[PDB]
Design a protein around this nucleic acid. Sequence first.
RNA 1: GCAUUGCUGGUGCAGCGCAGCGCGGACGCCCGAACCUGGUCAGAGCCGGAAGGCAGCAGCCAUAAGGGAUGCUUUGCGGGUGCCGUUGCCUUCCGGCAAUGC
Lengths: 413, 283
Amino acid sequence: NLTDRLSRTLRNISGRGRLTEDNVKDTLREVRMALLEADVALPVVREFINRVKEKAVGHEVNKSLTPGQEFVKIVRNELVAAMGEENQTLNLAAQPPAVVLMAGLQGAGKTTSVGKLGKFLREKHKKKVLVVSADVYRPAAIKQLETLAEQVGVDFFPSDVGQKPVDIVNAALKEAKLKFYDVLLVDTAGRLHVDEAMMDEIKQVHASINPVETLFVVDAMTGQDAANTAKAFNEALPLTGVVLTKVDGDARGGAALSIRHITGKPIKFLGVGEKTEALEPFHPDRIASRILGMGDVLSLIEDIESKVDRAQAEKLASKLKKGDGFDLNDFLEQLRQMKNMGGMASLMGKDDKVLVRMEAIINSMTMKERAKPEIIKGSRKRRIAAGSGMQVQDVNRLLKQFDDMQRMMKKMK
Amino acid sequence: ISLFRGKKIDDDLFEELEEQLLIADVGVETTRKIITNLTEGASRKQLRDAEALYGLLKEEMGEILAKVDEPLNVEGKAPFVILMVGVNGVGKTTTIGKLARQFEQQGKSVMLAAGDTFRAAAVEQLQVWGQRNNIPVIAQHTGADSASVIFDAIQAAKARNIDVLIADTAGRLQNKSHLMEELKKIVRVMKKLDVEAPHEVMLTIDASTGQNAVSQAKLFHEAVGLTGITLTKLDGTAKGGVIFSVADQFGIPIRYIGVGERIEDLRPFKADDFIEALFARED
RNA sequence: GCAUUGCUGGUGCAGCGCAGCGCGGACGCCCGAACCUGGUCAGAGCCGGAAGGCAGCAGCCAUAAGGGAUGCUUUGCGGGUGCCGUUGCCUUCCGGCAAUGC
Ligand SMILES: Nc1nc2c(ncn2[C@@H]2O[C@H](COP(=O)(O)OP(=O)(O)CP(=O)(O)O)[C@@H](O)[C@H]2O)c(=O)[nH]1
Ligand SMILES: Nc1nc2c(ncn2[C@@H]2O[C@H](COP(=O)(O)OP(=O)(O)CP(=O)(O)O)[C@@H](O)[C@H]2O)c(=O)[nH]1
Ligand SMILES: [Mg+2]
Ligand SMILES: [Mg+2]
């Protein structure tokens, strides 16, 4: 469109003015629509909009960049800190046989992550791991962990379907302490937070065995429901860590911001596949840019800032190096301001050929040679005379006069 | 729902309805498309009664699910093949156990196929569902080719004279292309015994899943060609309003709904009753 | 239910092949030579009686040698790579039809 090029230049213009709602309201709609499409719950979306507003207007105003692009930084930076206050919070193992309880909804990725946790604590942390299953509801859920234990090379605790889940976890720790196992990885069944019956089972199991780490496993693609899930699972169990699974998917993973907001418990692990190798320690910088979606905007903001940052440092470094006060660059500027005078020093101070010849010698020099007279030597002196049409003695004469000038400059002013 | 009766129609109540629509995971492009039909509908008849907004919403939502209301007809073919596809952990295997018992209820012989030859004890899991219904399960040890196993299950379903065969597959994420061309590879070897087979490509989608369901339907349909949808784990706080965006975009029919972990906890999809349960103010 | 036999299929090796990762080069982008590359040559230099030239330094532009960020691009090389493809094969492992026997 014809008005498209006109409207683009009006917004692209350097907004020196204070970051106010007038510029925000038009572009804040893009952020709210992306967050809802990312799958972030409304109580966290509505509270985060107000959280950004207090920081956006509050003395955080830039002269350069689009007004609707300098506020995106405030959205982006506050998203990273809200998601991961601490980077890589690993499972505590500074106590006797450590208990790691795994709880979440039906089919979140619990038993697989117990298996992926085994390889982590066995190869990267070298611990005596023991795996147990309290899932006596899902068909062959016990045999599932049994094969996963054989895969990593971790010892597995035997269990029946006839066995009570509360007695399994109680007798599991008994064998764990006896053989002095470093970590006791406890796997539980799929539990719906609505169900009073099994939600009472996990609470009783959390009481039966004191878990130093109560990891809440949740699917990365889970939508608005994560609000109801995070509330009930933290209000019933004292959680200490979140495990986000199926992060390898194309899903934005909006629940990750929804879980960290409501529970307040930090995300500790990320699953990137079905395999046992597929476990990564939590990092918010990566997942924050994945929830935002708009990367083509952030790719230019970080590219424009770098272009300015390199130019601001290079123009200041040259000024800090030339801060000594005198060099041949300043001496040449004195000659031209003197030649510009219609009366001349010859008639004022009571010889003319000397000044004209002196300008030509400094003119033939490089930028480096003018800034530092000490680098001029043998071949460097022969180069100046060849192009200037003077002699080796002429250049050497000029340099001696300049040396006495800087000695007189530093001694006075 | 009852709190809407004692309120006056304004821009504040429309914002109250939009936020209760978004909390169902319906979407942005799907929620604002209905609000455009509601704001137009409120001027068409010119009604300032609270009783109308609850009725108008049920009418337009029920119009979308009216296009996608066709039930599954497994009868006629022998063996009728139902290919179970979807992402990792949505209820695929459990749904087969629920399905096979509703077909035995209808009086049709059922056989099962253990196709998740990638996930640990998945053969063993489907084998328990076979024993729960007293149905034969064609299976091979985990690690074997899924496509070639389902092929041997069809060759068995034909020879043993079976009315319905439900074939299981592994949990696969739409972005994992190698696993997607593996799903295509399953159907390719299926056509070697029957060009009509698979007679159904049932996609299982978790009720709690968000806007991932959009690409979950898109890329699964683009690859194999979905003909069925089962909205499982709907028994919780999960409304699964994302199904309105799916039917409006691809038009794949919803066949059944998962409402529990037990065999009896499965019902065929009903359009009118689904809307009533969406705004259920219950504890 | 178990064995024998036929056919067929998967695993399982093994060899090619792809995908991939690592390292080396292309191509390209950006940076880039006081002088010993070129263009332009301010100032200044030179030849001639003048007119006119010649020579050429800085700067600036281009750019060998050579760096640097990186790439649904291209290739060579190598793998305690491989939810891929393929041919070949043997010991067992496991399936699918079919024939017999307890
Ligand atoms: N791609 C991918 N798949 C995952 C990840 N984590 C788990 N899975 C997969 O999701 C599915 C469910 O995993 P599982 O470990 O059985 O979940 P669960 O929560 O124990 C199931 P239940 O609630 O019945 O006990 C499996 O197919 C598994 O391979 C992940 O990070 N990425
Ligand atoms: N509460 C509830 N749980 C369900 C429903 N349908 C399935 N589940 C549960 O979800 C979990 C995963 O079910 P499963 O049938 O193994 O899913 P899947 O998609 O085959 C897993 P994979 O992708 O690994 O093969 C199981 O714990 C199961 O009992 C449902 O309608 N409600
Ligand atoms: Mg489990
Ligand atoms: Mg399954």
